[PDB]
Design a protein around this ligand. Sequence first.
Ligand SMILES: CCCCCCCCCCCCCCCCCC(=O)OC[C@H](COP(=O)([O-])OCC(O)COP(=O)([O-])OC[C@@H](COC(=O)CCCCCCCCCCCCCCCCC)OC(=O)CCCCCCCCCCCCCCCCC)OC(=O)CCCCCCCCCCCCCCCCC
Ligand SMILES: CCCCCCCCCCCCCCCCCC(=O)OC[C@H](COP(=O)([O-])OCC(O)COP(=O)([O-])OC[C@@H](COC(=O)CCCCCCCCCCCCCCCCC)OC(=O)CCCCCCCCCCCCCCCCC)OC(=O)CCCCCCCCCCCCCCCCC
Ligand SMILES: CCCCCCCCCCCCCCCCCC(=O)OC[C@H](COP(=O)([O-])OCC(O)COP(=O)([O-])OC[C@@H](COC(=O)CCCCCCCCCCCCCCCCC)OC(=O)CCCCCCCCCCCCCCCCC)OC(=O)CCCCCCCCCCCCCCCCC
Ligand SMILES: CCCCCCCCCCCCCCCCCC(=O)OC[C@H](COP(=O)([O-])OCC(O)COP(=O)([O-])OC[C@@H](COC(=O)CCCCCCCCCCCCCCCCC)OC(=O)CCCCCCCCCCCCCCCCC)OC(=O)CCCCCCCCCCCCCCCCC
Ligand SMILES: CCCCCCCCCCCCCCCCCC(=O)OC[C@H](COP(=O)(O)OCCN)OC(=O)CCCCCCCCCCCCCCCCC
Ligand SMILES: CCCCCCCCCCCCCCCCCC(=O)OC[C@H](COP(=O)(O)OCCN)OC(=O)CCCCCCCCCCCCCCCCC
Ligand SMILES: CCCCCCCCCCCCCCCC(=O)OC[C@H](COP(=O)(O)O)OC(=O)CCCCCCCCCCCCCCC
Ligand code: HEM
Lengths: 101, 80, 49, 54, 106, 172, 64, 113
Amino acid sequence: IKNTDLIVYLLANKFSILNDNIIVSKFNISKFNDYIKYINNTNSIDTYLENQIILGLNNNTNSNITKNINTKLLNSYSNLKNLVNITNNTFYLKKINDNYN
Amino acid sequence: MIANFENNLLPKYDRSEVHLIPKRQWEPAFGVWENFLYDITEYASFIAPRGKEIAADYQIQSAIPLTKEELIEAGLYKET
Amino acid sequence: KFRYRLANETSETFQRRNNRMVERQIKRFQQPQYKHAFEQLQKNIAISS
Amino acid sequence: FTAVSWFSIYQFARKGAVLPVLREYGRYFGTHRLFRQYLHTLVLPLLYTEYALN
Amino acid sequence: LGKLNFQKLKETNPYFASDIVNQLDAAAAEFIKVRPAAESEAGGFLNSLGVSSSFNTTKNDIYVVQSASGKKLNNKEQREAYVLEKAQKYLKEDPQSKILDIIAQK
Amino acid sequence: VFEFLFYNQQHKTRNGYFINHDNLMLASLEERKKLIFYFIANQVPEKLDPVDRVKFNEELSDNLSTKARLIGSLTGLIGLVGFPYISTRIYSRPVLNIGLSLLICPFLYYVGNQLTYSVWEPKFIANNNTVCELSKKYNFTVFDFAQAKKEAHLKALRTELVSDNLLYSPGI
Amino acid sequence: MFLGIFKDVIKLLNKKVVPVYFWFFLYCFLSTMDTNIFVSSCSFLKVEVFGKDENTTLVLLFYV
Amino acid sequence: AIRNFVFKISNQIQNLAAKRSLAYLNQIDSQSVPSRATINMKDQVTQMQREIDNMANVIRAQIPDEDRAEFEILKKYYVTGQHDSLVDPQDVLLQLDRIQVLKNLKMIELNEE
Ligand SMILES: CCCCCCCCCCCCCCCCCC(=O)OC[C@H](COP(=O)([O-])OCC(O)COP(=O)([O-])OC[C@@H](COC(=O)CCCCCCCCCCCCCCCCC)OC(=O)CCCCCCCCCCCCCCCCC)OC(=O)CCCCCCCCCCCCCCCCC
Ligand SMILES: CCCCCCCCCCCCCCCCCC(=O)OC[C@H](COP(=O)([O-])OCC(O)COP(=O)([O-])OC[C@@H](COC(=O)CCCCCCCCCCCCCCCCC)OC(=O)CCCCCCCCCCCCCCCCC)OC(=O)CCCCCCCCCCCCCCCCC
Ligand SMILES: CCCCCCCCCCCCCCCCCC(=O)OC[C@H](COP(=O)([O-])OCC(O)COP(=O)([O-])OC[C@@H](COC(=O)CCCCCCCCCCCCCCCCC)OC(=O)CCCCCCCCCCCCCCCCC)OC(=O)CCCCCCCCCCCCCCCCC
Ligand SMILES: CCCCCCCCCCCCCCCCCC(=O)OC[C@H](COP(=O)([O-])OCC(O)COP(=O)([O-])OC[C@@H](COC(=O)CCCCCCCCCCCCCCCCC)OC(=O)CCCCCCCCCCCCCCCCC)OC(=O)CCCCCCCCCCCCCCCCC
Ligand SMILES: CCCCCCCCCCCCCCCCCC(=O)OC[C@H](COP(=O)(O)OCCN)OC(=O)CCCCCCCCCCCCCCCCC
Ligand SMILES: CCCCCCCCCCCCCCCCCC(=O)OC[C@H](COP(=O)(O)OCCN)OC(=O)CCCCCCCCCCCCCCCCC
Ligand SMILES: CCCCCCCCCCCCCCCC(=O)OC[C@H](COP(=O)(O)O)OC(=O)CCCCCCCCCCCCCCC
Ligand code: HEM
């Protein structure tokens, strides 16, 4: 690799994160101390607010296969309106008469 | 409090299911040891990771909630 | 008490309160932060296994 | 033991059943699995007998 | 001048070089991170009659980048666009640059 | 925090000082004679004639004593490697470096000497023609071994007692 | 591949992996004080240096 | 038959492993025992880190101001630079030696004033 090209690539990658001073922490989660420090330092609120980003385990191929919902089973249970009432994804058992003799 | 936590947007039906993993039929033209090594490498390369992925998907889908659009389409939820 | 709510409430009152709670929970989940949390949870499924 | 094994192998081969032991064909001379099974059945017990007695 | 400035800055703050390297490697590629470690050039018994173990170790690390000021950081697509624009400008300045191949590698 | 620090301990795990009646009980006749002769020669050479003393000392120096000293010296040099351990262009900490060297080098020498003895003393006792011939010649007995054991312990006690006053000792 | 294995053995025994100091230590450990060429001929090392149970003066001079 | 039995054993083992490794994400287990266990583990880790930090803080408060800088250097090194290869301990030693130069100057001034 050419030195100038490598330097340009490194500078571009460094400045892509932010055109301002940044703080980078390197952790090896396979190690106990590194893992504890990494979990202690990573906060979900910062990640959501975009003030912090984690690089190293992208795994961007997280798009699932859109698990199909059991529409047939849901309709079958809905048809039984004398036993179960469906509301807000909740199945309420209609009170039955234990004394039926 | 987390003990009594509950998630009501998950599907309420059982998530147990069957997955088909095609086998490698025994090849008489190879021999006992060659077929055994073929089976071992198949288990280490395709069967084992496939089952691990299936189990991980089963574990994660039980936590992944159902979207509002999916709920509306299934009729489980009515807006307003 | 929360775990054994049903034992103390009647059918209709329990249905009303549970419907209110579930609607509010659905709204909270539809709020953007929860969607991001679920996406992050699903992001690293392979590594966490 | 050799006679019983040979008789069983012959009968099952006549009926079309061959035990899936040893390669189907030889690597160098292409000897058939049945022939190599006969050879092994003949030789292995003799070697085992010699080793046990020794 | 560069060497003297590096020496002075490192002596003033030993974490200067480490911080710069971490900042450079945060968004760097896996093959970039795979590079070996520094080798000891010092001589003596360990170099003549002994054996000095290398500094190389496992290079499976996760870089957590946080803005000191607190401004929102660029997403993956934004970073890709920034890198592509810089690569295009550098190629325009020098046609023979292989920044395109470097980026496409990873 | 006890005797193991200020008392003498370098003579207890070397030169067969640990040989007692337990080894002799299981040893055969020839092995017992060889062990007894080795113990007597190492601990109480006075029972041997001057020629035998000189020959045994030469063999011991060639095989175990000087070899262990050399190996301990090599280990001590290995420890010396990197001296000064901590220093810089401002200060060199000569006293700290000297203390560290004095603490580390003798320990490495001790480790090397103990290793050499543990490895070679059994082989030297078992397969030394000189020791075999001298043991056959002298033909020591269990009574001689017991006397030598008592004399060796008394010699160790005398050596410890003599060095009681290494700084000031008028006498009367 | 035998030549390749021989080259691999030579490389694995190379200086950068198996120190010459280790080789010398092994030679001294395996050889006695009368067979060791480095010290059998030299009487000073075999007597004055390593032949004395207590050589504090020489040790101190060497250390200084 | 034998292959089917082996695969059944493998499937049961894989399900057990997946549960034991990722049961804290879902609420399949009533009372969310694995989730509570994971939360407890994280709480213990954070508490240990904060305990180290608070011990450092109290030692800093109790330390004399003359060597407070040396304590700061040692604390920062032990926290960050111990595990970092790019951090050369020679520079930390040089800083300590500069502090020691100042201390020696003050000592000699006191002795020979
Ligand atoms: C109580 C004691 C204390 C310990 C506790 C008890 C322990 C009990 C252990 C019991 C273990 C039972 C194992 C059962 C296996 C059943 C396999 C099977 O399904 O059978 C059908 C199978 C049918 O074969 P196939 O798959 O159809 O292939 C034939 C094809 O025609 C040909 O196909 P191909 O040509 O296309 O390709 C294959 C071909 C390709 O060629 C090869 O790959 C051949 C390679 C040969 C070996 C090369 C290395 C040579 C150096 C020596 C070994 C050092 C170890 C390193 C080995 C590396 C891997 C081979 O190789 C073959 O022909 C395969 C068979 C090779 C058999 C010859 C070697 C036998 C001995 C092996 C070493 C045993 C350990 C020795 C330890 C040291 C002893 C001093 O049967 C055989 O042909 C082989 C059966 C072997 C049975 C072994 C039973 C051993 C019992 C005694 C154990 C103790 C031994 C001494 C050590 C004691 C230590 C304490
Ligand atoms: C003391 C003598 C006792 C003799 C007893 C009688 C039986 C054995 C001799 C029989 C001879 C006549 C047989 C009829 C011939 C008919 C014509 C014909 O087509 O042949 C039928 C057939 C071959 O026809 P094919 O259609 O080409 O079938 C080929 C299939 O691959 C073959 O597939 P497979 O279905 O036969 O299965 C593979 C084969 C297993 O064959 C293997 O590939 C296993 C190899 C294991 C190697 C273990 C490490 C060896 C380390 C070096 C040892 C140096 C010598 C040490 C000597 C110590 C003192 C004795 O068998 C098995 O795996 C099942 C049995 C379990 C293993 C028990 C083996 C016991 C052998 C005892 C005799 C050994 C004599 C050694 C002579 C000196 C050799 C230098 O012959 C046999 O089945 C007999 C094979 C006898 C062993 C051959 C070994 C070859 C590898 C040698 C490696 C070392 C030298 C390399 C030199 C390289 C150039 C410089
Ligand atoms: C087990 C097999 C034995 C085979 C014997 C065969 C006969 C020949 C032996 C050949 C080796 C010795 C002679 C040549 C040495 C050459 C060294 C050299 O130039 O390398 C530069 C080398 C450069 O280091 P490096 O590679 O960059 O690694 C950096 C590490 O920081 C440096 O450390 P490291 O991670 O590299 O590992 C070495 C490390 C330790 O590593 C080991 O454990 C070594 C393990 C065995 C390695 C064996 C390698 C040689 C194998 C030869 C045989 C091959 C046979 C092959 C044939 C087939 C066999 C089936 O040593 C130390 O640094 C220890 C210093 C502290 C003292 C420890 C001992 C006392 C206890 C103190 C406890 C204090 C606790 C706190 C206070 C508590 C208060 C209550 O320098 C050193 O390592 C300096 C070491 C200075 C201290 C050495 C003496 C102290 C004891 C050492 C450990 C115990 C073994 C002693 C020897 C035993 C002989 C039987
Ligand atoms: C996990 C790993 C670690 C742990 C495990 C380790 C295991 C292995 C341990 C052993 C090997 C490794 C050792 C590592 C540590 C080394 C030391 C260290 O830490 O260094 C850094 C550091 C050294 O300080 P620094 O900040 O690095 O500074 C470097 C120095 O500047 C450098 O010095 P400098 O270059 O600045 O030179 C200083 C020099 C300055 O140089 C000069 O220019 C010389 C000026 C003076 C010239 C004149 C000299 C002669 C003066 C004579 C005066 C009269 C004498 C009267 C004697 C009377 C006797 C009865 O000053 C002098 O030497 C002169 C003063 C002489 C000494 C004091 C004399 C006292 C006389 C008697 C007083 C009382 C009389 C009362 C009379 C009645 C009332 C009036 O250490 C410390 O600060 C403290 C360390 C404490 C260590 C404790 C260790 C305990 C034992 C542990 C092992 C055993 C137990 C198991 C423990 C297991 C774990 C729990
Ligand atoms: C609870 C844990 C500790 C328990 C043991 C406490 C022992 C206290 C006594 C001093 C210990 C010094 C360190 C260890 C030495 C071990 C060997 C030893 O003590 O040897 C004996 C000798 C003193 O014995 P002495 O009575 O003079 O000789 C009579 C002979 N019949 O020893 C000496 O003469 C050695 C000491 C001489 C005086 C030195 C005074 C200043 C301290 C210097 C220490 C050495 C340098 C270390 C530098 C690096 C590490 C800091
Ligand atoms: C060392 C500290 C000096 C402090 C000076 C300032 C204070 C002065 C006030 C008096 C102090 C007296 C201190 C006496 C300490 C004695 C220590 C001791 O007994 O050490 C052992 C030493 C010899 O023993 P050793 O051979 O080494 O081995 C152990 C023997 N089982 O034992 C002996 O030597 C035998 C006993 C001797 C006791 C002598 C007591 C009077 C000494 C007067 C000296 C005056 C001149 C000194 C220099 C000027 C001081 C200003
Ligand atoms: C002018 C230089 C002359 C010498 C030049 C070549 C020397 C090469 C070998 C080094 C010396 C080895 C001596 C071995 C015999 C011996 O010591 O003999 C004296 C005793 C012998 O011990 P034993 O009585 O247990 O056999 O040695 C000891 O007690 C151990 C001392 C250390 C010996 C190894 C050397 C370690 C490094 C020395 C510097 C560190 C501080 C030492 C104390 C101040
Ligand atoms: C391979 C290394 C060495 C060999 C082969 C060697 C060999 C010898 C020999 C053969 C002698 C003559 C002994 C006699 O007079 O009978 C001797 C003497 C001597 N050697 Fe060495 N030597 C070596 C290393 C050293 C070293 C490293 C030193 C010192 C640091 C040293 C110091 C001496 C001294 C002082 C004498 C004179 C002894 C006397 O006159 O009594 N030698 N050496």
